[PDB]
Design a protein around this ligand. Sequence first.
Ligand SMILES: Cc1cc2nc3c(=O)[nH]c(=O)nc-3n(C[C@H](O)[C@H](O)[C@H](O)COP(=O)(O)OP(=O)(O)OC[C@H]3O[C@@H](n4cnc5c(N)ncnc54)[C@H](O)[C@@H]3O)c2cc1C
Ligand SMILES: Cc1cc2nc3c(=O)[nH]c(=O)nc-3n(C[C@H](O)[C@H](O)[C@H](O)COP(=O)(O)OP(=O)(O)OC[C@H]3O[C@@H](n4cnc5c(N)ncnc54)[C@H](O)[C@@H]3O)c2cc1C
Ligand SMILES: *[C@@H]1O[C@H](CO)[C@@H](O[C@@H]2O[C@H](CO)[C@@H](O[C@H]3O[C@H](CO)[C@@H](O)[C@H](O)[C@@H]3O)[C@H](O)[C@H]2NC(C)=O)[C@H](O)[C@H]1NC(C)=O
Ligand SMILES: *[C@@H]1O[C@H](CO)[C@@H](O[C@@H]2O[C@H](CO)[C@@H](O[C@H]3O[C@H](CO)[C@@H](O)[C@H](O)[C@@H]3O)[C@H](O)[C@H]2NC(C)=O)[C@H](O)[C@H]1NC(C)=O
Ligand SMILES: *[C@@H]1O[C@H](CO)[C@@H](O)[C@H](O)[C@H]1NC(C)=O
Ligand SMILES: *[C@@H]1O[C@H](CO)[C@@H](O)[C@H](O)[C@H]1NC(C)=O
Ligand SMILES: *[C@@H]1O[C@H](CO)[C@@H](O)[C@H](O)[C@H]1NC(C)=O
Ligand SMILES: *[C@@H]1O[C@H](CO)[C@@H](O)[C@H](O)[C@H]1NC(C)=O
Ligand SMILES: *[C@@H]1O[C@H](CO)[C@@H](O)[C@H](O)[C@H]1NC(C)=O
Ligand SMILES: *[C@@H]1O[C@H](CO)[C@@H](O)[C@H](O)[C@H]1NC(C)=O
Ligand SMILES: *[C@@H]1O[C@H](CO)[C@@H](O)[C@H](O)[C@H]1NC(C)=O
Ligand SMILES: *[C@@H]1O[C@H](CO)[C@@H](O)[C@H](O)[C@H]1NC(C)=O
Lengths: 590, 590
Amino acid sequence: MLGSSFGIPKNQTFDYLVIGGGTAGLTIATRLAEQGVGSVAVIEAGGFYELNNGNLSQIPAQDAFYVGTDLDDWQPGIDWGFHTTPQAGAYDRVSHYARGKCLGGSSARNYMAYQRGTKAAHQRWADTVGDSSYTWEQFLPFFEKSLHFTPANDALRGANASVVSDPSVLGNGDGPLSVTYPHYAQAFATWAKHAFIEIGLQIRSGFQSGALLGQSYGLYTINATTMHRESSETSFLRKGLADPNLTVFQSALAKRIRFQDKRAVGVDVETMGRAYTLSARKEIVLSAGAFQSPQLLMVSGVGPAATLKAHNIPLVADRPGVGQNMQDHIIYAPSYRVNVITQSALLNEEFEAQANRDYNERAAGIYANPTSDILAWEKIPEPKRSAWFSNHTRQVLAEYPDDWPEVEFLTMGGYFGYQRNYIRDNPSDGYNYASLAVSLCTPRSRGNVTITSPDAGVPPVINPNWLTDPVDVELAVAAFKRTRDFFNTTAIKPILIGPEYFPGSQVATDAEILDHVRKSFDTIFHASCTCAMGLANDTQAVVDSKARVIGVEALRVVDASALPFLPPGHPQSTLYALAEKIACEISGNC
Amino acid sequence: MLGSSFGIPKNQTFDYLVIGGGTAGLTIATRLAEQGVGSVAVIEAGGFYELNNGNLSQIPAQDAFYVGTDLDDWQPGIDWGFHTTPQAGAYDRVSHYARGKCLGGSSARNYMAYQRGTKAAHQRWADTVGDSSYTWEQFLPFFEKSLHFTPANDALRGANASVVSDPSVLGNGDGPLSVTYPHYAQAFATWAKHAFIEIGLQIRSGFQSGALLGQSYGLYTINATTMHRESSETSFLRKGLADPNLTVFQSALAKRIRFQDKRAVGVDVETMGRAYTLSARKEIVLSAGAFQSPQLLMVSGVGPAATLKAHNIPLVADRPGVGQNMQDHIIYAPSYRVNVITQSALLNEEFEAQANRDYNERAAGIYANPTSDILAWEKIPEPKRSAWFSNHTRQVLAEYPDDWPEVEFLTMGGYFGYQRNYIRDNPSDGYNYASLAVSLCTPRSRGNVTITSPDAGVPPVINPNWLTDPVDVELAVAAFKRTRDFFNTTAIKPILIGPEYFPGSQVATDAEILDHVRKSFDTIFHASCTCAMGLANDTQAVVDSKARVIGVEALRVVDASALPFLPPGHPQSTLYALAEKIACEISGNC
Ligand SMILES: Cc1cc2nc3c(=O)[nH]c(=O)nc-3n(C[C@H](O)[C@H](O)[C@H](O)COP(=O)(O)OP(=O)(O)OC[C@H]3O[C@@H](n4cnc5c(N)ncnc54)[C@H](O)[C@@H]3O)c2cc1C
Ligand SMILES: Cc1cc2nc3c(=O)[nH]c(=O)nc-3n(C[C@H](O)[C@H](O)[C@H](O)COP(=O)(O)OP(=O)(O)OC[C@H]3O[C@@H](n4cnc5c(N)ncnc54)[C@H](O)[C@@H]3O)c2cc1C
Ligand SMILES: *[C@@H]1O[C@H](CO)[C@@H](O[C@@H]2O[C@H](CO)[C@@H](O[C@H]3O[C@H](CO)[C@@H](O)[C@H](O)[C@@H]3O)[C@H](O)[C@H]2NC(C)=O)[C@H](O)[C@H]1NC(C)=O
Ligand SMILES: *[C@@H]1O[C@H](CO)[C@@H](O[C@@H]2O[C@H](CO)[C@@H](O[C@H]3O[C@H](CO)[C@@H](O)[C@H](O)[C@@H]3O)[C@H](O)[C@H]2NC(C)=O)[C@H](O)[C@H]1NC(C)=O
Ligand SMILES: *[C@@H]1O[C@H](CO)[C@@H](O)[C@H](O)[C@H]1NC(C)=O
Ligand SMILES: *[C@@H]1O[C@H](CO)[C@@H](O)[C@H](O)[C@H]1NC(C)=O
Ligand SMILES: *[C@@H]1O[C@H](CO)[C@@H](O)[C@H](O)[C@H]1NC(C)=O
Ligand SMILES: *[C@@H]1O[C@H](CO)[C@@H](O)[C@H](O)[C@H]1NC(C)=O
Ligand SMILES: *[C@@H]1O[C@H](CO)[C@@H](O)[C@H](O)[C@H]1NC(C)=O
Ligand SMILES: *[C@@H]1O[C@H](CO)[C@@H](O)[C@H](O)[C@H]1NC(C)=O
Ligand SMILES: *[C@@H]1O[C@H](CO)[C@@H](O)[C@H](O)[C@H]1NC(C)=O
Ligand SMILES: *[C@@H]1O[C@H](CO)[C@@H](O)[C@H](O)[C@H]1NC(C)=O
């Protein structure tokens, strides 16, 4: 009975509460319920994205809806409508920062890329938090536990789009999280493989074995049968319905964590104006993400003393790291008109109608593609390194491990432009558009989150502060010039129609390149480290290596906020794994 | 793809809009979508009751949750939290009036009784609205079209609980609305059959063939396989999700119908704070029910001129009938301790655990019962008639048709008391409690609905005004004495434990009985006739026989508000049928 899984908004007691039915939230809630620790309730402000955002969150190719910087490019059924402070690195631009408000959280909204960090990143993690269980070899089983891998389908993809994978690290098939290759590869990506080789990027066997340098076809959180998005909702929550130990509270806003002495004992909740308190006998897990986890700590009395005093919040623990040390990745892309099919073709009615039938009848065609296909990773090579970087920049980059890339390239079968609104500004003049996006994997810029109010119903103040460190500025210009090197290869030339479409060659000098990047970049949505994992004796750390909040009892944080630092690339794989790990830490029954 | 059925909250155009995803709403929306008239959108303020009220709305025996008169006996996931004005007939009591806020509306909340009115009621309907298609023989196919009848299961019910039905009027099996007999009959009802005969109520072949006088086992909107509630959501909406012509907007509040000249062209909607306008090319159907249909007309400029002026609403049509002539039924019941299992046994943990397993594993046991089982109908008999009624009362009752009953009796395997809150005040002292409820089928009292604001987000002012006509007062006392006659039968005596438990024999005189009824009665939730069907030339009528709103174009009302008068007994059968009829009227493709 479906309804048996869903809670009634009144005072009651569970063994465990998880705040936030997002990526980490639904994973840890489902695993705790299955691991015999007693009753678990998960509290989520949103509903099902299948009811609240049409089929836009279910179709991989529709992932560009409601992610633009424009303040109005969102709707309240899937997005919080959060905007940044005026951004020092983006000419004081106030931008929309997309966050999932739904069961699945930002796993309902992401571009579905599944890629793990490097052995050396895991080594740095182990060192920073003083726990060797975070080293690659000890952590890997938690990465594998979640997965149901399906190999590439060569018949639907075409021979051109053959993949190089490492199945030995993609689990035993028993996990609920579908990971596979899309049934459709962008024709652009097929050409990009040759261009990547010409600029010195060797093919490797996927991005799941603890190394990145080189190129490969990406793996995605997509169901191999339906080519629907795989979120934490379609994977973990669907398994957890059927577990009588799991209760879901949806359309439910957590307002305050309650403390008796320094012990977390319950959560104040509002469901459609009805206030109630859920009590926890054992532990509360905060999984509200990089913006709202720190906000809930602060309005509950855990955070910087001066902030809590200024908003009349009684102090429970002076923890100055709460909302500090925010890390993020950025993305921007030039675009060309190309002589191959890209997502542009969906603007043509006769083409869309065929793609629509291919998707629903055969799980095939361009709708079955998340826009991306091939990722590539490098250090900026010599001799460009000495020309493009100051001595200070080269000294800072030499402190990163050899395996830790500086720049990520992503094939995109669509137009980025200024990323104001990808749907409105999608060029409609009858050409196919493709982009080569770049992301920077060594961000030095640090941001923060604070509050204007003790009410969690008021949005937090979000200041990512991207592109403010001189190292990020120099890297941003270098990455842009590498996209120009990609587009000047003889391998890619035959599909290009005329010169660079966006921005165009008139963007030439270092200062013009920087100015264009400052106008055309956005976050790639990897906000993290606002409840950073570190040593219990570090006054800036928020959680220890067991994800316990320092200064209080029976409270953990398990989400992107808990990361000690942002590892290179796409973090969802790591958040699934971290949730798997802290579930076993709590239960002891794995 | 589920999401393909659900709308995005932005400006867009459909051929038809239905306001209110309730009993009538989801029926007409689904049928219009199937009948080739183009695109249909349904707008509903609530969500799925399966997500928003646990399993309480899915289990028939849990129908007593959130229906009490106490102002706090509701939660915002299934109920509007409406209260009445101070009630002239109930010692100025301000009472909660349960209304479904969910897909299915009040079909999510009702006691699931399926019973039709009388041939003579249908004759009066035809005469009042000037349309012979409302006579029994012409209207019957619209009653049958909806249904999937399953016969009584004698093996699960027991031989004691054999039924007398007329399958020839219960359709061909093709309709989505499950109607059947419960898998479990209250032991109390089994005894009640003999007691009903002793006080002169003969067995008849069900309540679906245009006659009521006598007794029979009731038919219910329950799925025959699962013994889950059958709402308009589990029947019509579930069929309509496969129809690409149907779009659902849930968590969507309609604020205003828009008029160009006198033509309805769109609806102003708010979904979680996001305002948008849905446009209608052809017709708008208002299905917001007896309280909110008249409210939406008035805030849109259709209603009594003086009311709209007083709240700064521009006048579109002076229609003084809007919100007037409200009709309703009431219910109250004495109770006895009884020597048989009733719903009381669910307070015993060992009994509940077995009933829980019986329900989920075999669709059997007391959870598979809607509380009622046998209905009985009469005129107050002679010689009690001359003793209990004034000459004026007898003159008014003689104007009703011979087939139209004055009093309904309902077996109830539970305690009513003052109906403040059935769950809190459920006696827990170890006895089984049963009640014999009565409802009055000839209400003379008339109520109304008005507004305090042009904002549909502000609740309407709801004044049922029950028990204010001297005919209803005399009938209320007579009905109560007939419950005493039932409980003094020699047939029922052997299961009674001690004397009348509630109110008790100390309630003796006519004035004491009236006083007790005024304290212990509530609505039985049949609010209707606030957008009454009549002749186009009647200034008090709101809709014509085609359900078109008089004085404007392209606007219909199809719900309990549209009834010309309240027919005897349970109206959901008539609302399904009326929705079937106006669907065919609109489409011309049946
Ligand atoms: C557009 C986009 C693209 C991305 N692409 C990728 C990608 O391709 N690969 C990848 O690895 N990562 C990607 N990411 C990032 C990755 O998805 C996120 O880092 C991850 O989803 C965050 O997980 P989380 O559990 O930390 O938070 P979330 O998944 O955001 O979960 C937080 C949850 O808590 C709820 N919540 C917050 N406050 C409250 C409250 N008070 N009460 C109740 N509920 C509350 C929210 O509604 C939400 O459901 C992308 C992000 C976005 C936005
Ligand atoms: C507790 C209870 C027991 C009952 N028992 C029985 C019984 O056993 N048998 C029987 O025959 N009848 C019974 N009834 C009555 C029967 O269920 C109702 O008369 C019938 O459901 C009314 O249907 P409707 O479409 O007129 O209104 P509803 O089904 O109430 O539909 C109105 C819908 O419109 C929505 N809405 C209102 N305003 C807006 C707006 N502005 N924007 C968007 N959506 C809006 C509401 O949320 C609701 O879903 C019972 C009623 C109740 C409350
Ligand atoms: C309607 O919803 C209720 C859940 O909200 C449900 O109550 C729950 O019933 C489950 C059994 O399915 C109980 O869970 C049990 O879990 C372990 C199994 O590993 C048992 O050993 C325990 O005894 C425990 O009872 C929950 O205790 C119970 N929860 C609540 C809130 O009471 C009802 O069962 C549902 N009703 C029906 C008829 O299905
Ligand atoms: C994602 O959701 C969209 C609708 O919510 C859906 O678009 C809709 O698709 C249907 C076809 O499935 C169109 O309805 C058609 O119905 C009749 C058949 O009797 C046809 O003759 C008509 O031409 C009509 O097209 C709707 O027009 C269309 N709605 C809109 C707004 O376009 C998408 O198809 C869904 N996406 C996928 C990939 O399935
Ligand atoms: C619910 O819990 C809170 C705090 O424990 C309390 O303020 C409130 O009164 C409770 N409500 C009820 C009905 O007990
Ligand atoms: C993929 O979807 C199909 C069809 O819905 C389902 O049978 C399967 O379980 C899903 N796979 C995973 C691994 O979730
Ligand atoms: C690969 O195949 C697709 C579709 O057949 C085609 O559009 C694309 O150009 C091909 N690529 C190469 C490199 O030949
Ligand atoms: C956030 O960072 C900005 C820029 O570095 C700084 O000036 C601001 O005060 C910080 N806010 C908090 C509350 O730490
Ligand atoms: C009753 O429920 C069963 C199982 O869910 C289903 O197969 C059947 O179609 C339902 N019947 C109706 C008419 O809703
Ligand atoms: C009918 O049978 C049931 C046994 O299931 C019993 O509880 C009930 O009293 C019986 N009624 C009569 C009148 O014999
Ligand atoms: C939406 O429709 C209304 C109705 O006229 C009007 O405010 C405006 O034209 C539309 N707004 C947008 C954002 O298109
Ligand atoms: C509604 O009914 C009452 C009688 O109970 C009457 O006094 C009142 O004026 C009516 N109000 C409206 C607005 O018709």
